[model samples]
Target: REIKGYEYQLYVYASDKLFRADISEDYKTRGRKLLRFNGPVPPP
Candidate 1:
């Protein structure tokens, strides 16, 4: 588990920074599907 030290740091970057497809653990379109995936705007 501890071996994921850099792993956590890297997430912090892509999670809210950038990069997530080719360099990530997912494929191309798969990345976006998992990334900023959202629903209808606050239709409230």
Candidate 2:
């Protein structure tokens, strides 16, 4: 996988469901950009 410099990091609480986990940066460095609430998600 090609690595690129991160612009920022973000996170959110999906009722304890962890998703969009970009562990490259810390929570303090960024904010949530997009949040989805369309029920259970499928495997990638």
Candidate 3:
């Protein structure tokens, strides 16, 4: 059986801090989806 959700390892860059996020399929849309944070961000 296939999982009904999506899993992605993503990263975000900001001027002050770097962010790591895990995104999943919270709703609809193929190219569009909801993003959820997975853990605490590490210091640079």
Q: List the residue pairs that clash in candidate 3.
A: none
Candidates 1 and 2 compared: the better one by TM-score is 2
Per-model CA lDDT versus the true structure: 0.29, 0.42, 0.61
| Model 2 ranges with Cα > 4 A deviation | 1-7, 21-44
lDDT of 2: 0.42
- Give residue 22's error in model 3 in angstroms: 0.7
Q: Scored by Cα lDDT, where does model 1 land?
A: 0.29
Q: Candidate 3: which stretches are off by over 4 Å? A: 26-44
lDDT of 2 by residue, 1-44 (tens): 75442433234347765344433332564534433334334434
Rank candidates, TM-score, best first.
3, 2, 1
Top TM-score prediction, candidate number: 3
TM-score of each: 0.15, 0.20, 0.43
- Pitting candidate 1 against candidate 3, the one with the higher lDDT is 3
Q: CA lDDT of 3 in candidate 3?
A: 55
Top candidate (lDDT)? 3
lDDT per residue for candidate 3 within 1-44, as digits (tens), equals 86566777776766655677766663345454546654447754
